[PDB]
């Protein structure tokens, strides 16, 4: 279905002598593929997925030069923000950016994104029209007028409609057999007395990729909506993920409950039950 | 605004020269560019922050200093003849695509011997009676001769106010000999305007030579930067 | 050098349309500003265009961008005297530093309608016997002679415009250190 590219950028100022740390991470279909970190010994963009090994040295050199430019842009911007909010000079402050594009199967731009946050709060964003800005507070109004005056939206619109789209296309072609890879979940149910005559049934899914997955519990053909605990999907650390969902049930009825596991890599959704 | 200091500089070979730039734009990026016989903008040095600088395309022979956000200087420790050129400072908001805002330029001439620096003799030649009678117009001609180096700006002043209409000044000084340039300009007005004795005409030549920080020995006049004019009144005689 | 700008100098007739062109090597360049520089001043941004556009119009100035040829151009329609300046094309990719071409210096010289060439001798009253020669109101297609004699000097054609009314004219000046010099011969 859809495809996406994003670059997530962070600059964090530090009270000491050090310049802010600037980190940029690129994503294609939610998978990290490049990263730049100013704290590294030799700061440069690096590949973070195998299929990016296809790009030549000019790609990395010029993207690195771009990051260096961004790094200065974020430094200037952070100093401006200190002034806008009349903040004191001995603190730490975070500026973030999210940019990118969503595509259709036919390679049309569905939606472009260019937005910023300061101190974890939305600051300013380019509207879906790619021409106007939504500013969240008084400081952002200053930025908004500067950018309206200098016609900044036209430059971002050009990037989002052109380069973002065109490079995402190229990356998807290069990462075809690599992006399609899946690991199916392996699932099982565990049984945990906790009783006022009750037990927790916990349905586990392990070793799966990508992270997207749905776990359901049911009783006698009905989905169980409430009283069901669902942990955030978590990385195993080896490139696979884990998740569980649990329900509290009456002692003696455990066999009546079934868990279902839906995942892309599967041929069919898994269905399972506590097996004593 | 981006303002450069000085406007013109004459220096001896092996002398130290500092060109200054002040910008009021609150811009973080500053640049020094070199232009040669009116062509090129070659980046010498730039700076994106108040205490460091970076090399540009042609940094050799030059150092740069960014003592402040507003200030970026270009330093020639041992000035050479090859550094005779015009230098432009610029500022920009954040580099990349942000517009560069330039100063008006500083012309530098590097000479082996500063005793060759000489201001112009400025002469005003009065209109021909034949032009006045045959064309009902009166062309005044100003000639600046015998100056060195070619750091002159010529302007015309009618009744105390500068005029641009009816003027053509040579775009380039004519070199007569190794250490002697000449420049001409003409101002044309109507015969009736010239014939009015209430009208005052002045040719002004701004010569850029030595500054008051240059030392000069006891005897001869110091060839300092100065305005030198020749003038004439209208007449019905 | 990545931005190639020729010719060094160009003249076009007042009212005509100047076409200035530049080429570039780096096919990834995607922002193309032109800077305009008047004599005695610094450059200033004239007009700019992105790779996504074919043209940008502003008043009588139009930039064209030709991705496939890797060519930029600037068109000035109804070219007038106040447009005579040095024009710099420029180019960059992304946020990389700007690269300037060498600049083309443009002369907009007028079409003198009815030329009545004349030569006059002028006197400096603050001198014993100092004079010079004025060649004025001659045709725009004429070739002003350069000096054949040591000690005598002849200027290039200089065009003035008495905006008071519609009186524009070509002029040239000659002066000398020769004992028997007259304006009769010096301009013929």
């Amino acid at each position: 279905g859809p495809h996406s590219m994003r670059y997530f950028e962070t600059a964090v100022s530090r009270p000491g002598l050090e310049e802010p740390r600037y980190i940029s991470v690129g994503y294609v279909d939610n998978k990290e593929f490049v990263r730049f970190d100013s704290d590294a010994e030799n700061p440069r963009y690096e590949p973070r997925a195998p299929w990016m090994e296809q790009e030549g040295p000019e790609y990395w050199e010029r993207e690195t030069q771009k990051a260096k430019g961004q790094e200065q842009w974020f430094r200037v911007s952070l100093r401006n923000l200190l002034g806008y909010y009349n903040q004191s000079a001995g603190g730490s402050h975070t500026l973030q950016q999210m940019s990118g594009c969503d595509l259709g199967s036919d390679w049309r731009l569905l939606r472009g994104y260019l937005q910023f946050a300061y101190e974890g709060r939305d600051y300013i964003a380019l509207n879906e029209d790619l021409k106007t800005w939504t500013a969240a507070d008084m400081a952002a109004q200053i930025t908004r007028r500067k950018w309206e005056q200098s016609g900044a939206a036209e430059h971002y619109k050009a990037y989002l409609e052109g380069e973002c789209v065109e490079w995402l296309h190229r990356y998807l072609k290069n990462g075809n057999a690599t992006l399609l890879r899946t690991d199916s979940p392996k699932a099982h149910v565990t049984h945990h007395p906790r009783s006022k005559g009750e037990v927790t049934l916990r349905c586990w899914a392990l070793g799966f990729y990508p992270a997207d997955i749905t776990l359901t519990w049911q009783l006698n053909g009905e989905e169980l909506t409430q009283d069901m605990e669902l942990v955030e999907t978590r990385p195993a650390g080896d490139g696979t993920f884990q998740k569980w969902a649990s329900v509290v049930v009456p002692l003696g009825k455990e066999q009546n409950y079934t868990c279902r596991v839906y995942h892309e890599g599967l041929p069919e959704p898994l269905t399972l039950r506590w097996e004593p | 605004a981006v303002t450069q200091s000085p406007r013109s500089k004459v220096a001896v070979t092996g002398g130290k020269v500092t060109l200054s730039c002040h910008q009021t734009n609150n811009h973080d990026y500053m640049y020094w560019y070199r232009q040669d016989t009116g062509h090129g903008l070659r980046l010498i040095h730039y700076s994106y922050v108040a205490d460091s600088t970076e090399k540009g395309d042609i940094p050799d022979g030059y150092k740069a200093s960014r003592p402040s956000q507003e200030n970026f200087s270009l330093i020639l420790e041992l000035a050479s003849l090859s550094q005779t050129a015009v230098y432009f400072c610029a500022s920009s908001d954040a580099g990349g695509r942000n517009t560069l805002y330039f100063g008006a330029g500083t012309r530098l001439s590097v000479l082996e011997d500063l005793r060759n620096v000489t201001p112009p003799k400025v002469s005003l030649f009065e209109p021909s009676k034949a032009e006045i009678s045959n064309k009902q117009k009166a062309t005044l001609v100003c000639l600046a001769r015998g100056f060195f180096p070619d750091h002159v700006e010529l302007s015309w002043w009618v009744n105390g106010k500068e005029v641009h209409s009816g003027v053509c000044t040579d775009p380039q000084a004519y070199k007569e000999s190794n250490y002697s340039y000449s420049l001409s300009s003409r101002l044309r007005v109507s015969a009736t305007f010239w014939h009015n004795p209430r009208n005052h005409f002045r040719c002004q030549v701004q010569f850029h030579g030595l500054s008051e920080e240059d030392k000069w020995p006891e005897g001869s006049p110091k060839p300092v930067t100065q305005n030198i004019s020749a003038e004439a009144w209208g007449r019905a005689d | 050098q990545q931005v190639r700008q020729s010719p060094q100098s160009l003249t076009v007739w007042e009212g005509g349309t100047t076409v200035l062109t530049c080429s570039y090597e780096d096919s990834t360049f995607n922002y193309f500003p032109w800077y305009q520089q008047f004599p005695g001043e610094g450059p200033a941004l004239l007009i700019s265009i992105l790779s996504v556009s074919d043209k940008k119009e502003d008043g009588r100035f139009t930039t064209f961008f030709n991705k496939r040829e890797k060519k930029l151009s600037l068109h000035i329609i109804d070219s007038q005297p106040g447009d005579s300046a040095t024009y710099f094309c420029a180019a960059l990719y992304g946020n990389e530093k700007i690269t300037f071409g060498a600049g083309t210096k443009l002369t907009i010289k007028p079409n003198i309608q009815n030329p009545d060439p004349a030569v006059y001798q002028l006197k400096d009253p603050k001198s014993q016997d100092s004079t010079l020669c004025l060649f004025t109101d001659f045709d725009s297609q004429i070739n002003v002679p350069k000096t054949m004699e040591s000690g005598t000097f002849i200027t290039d054609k200089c065009v003035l415009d008495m905006k008071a009314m519609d009186s524009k004219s070509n002029g040239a000046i000659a002066w000398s250190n020769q004992t028997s010099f007259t304006c009769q011969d010096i301009f013929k």
């Binding site: 771009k66 911007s77 401006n80 900044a152 990037y159 | 990349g96 695509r97 | -």
Partner: peptide, 9 residues
């Protein structure tokens, strides 16, 4: 390829 910001905040 990554975005590139124009005018600063």
């Amino acid at each position: 390829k990554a975005p590139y910001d124009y005018a600063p905040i």
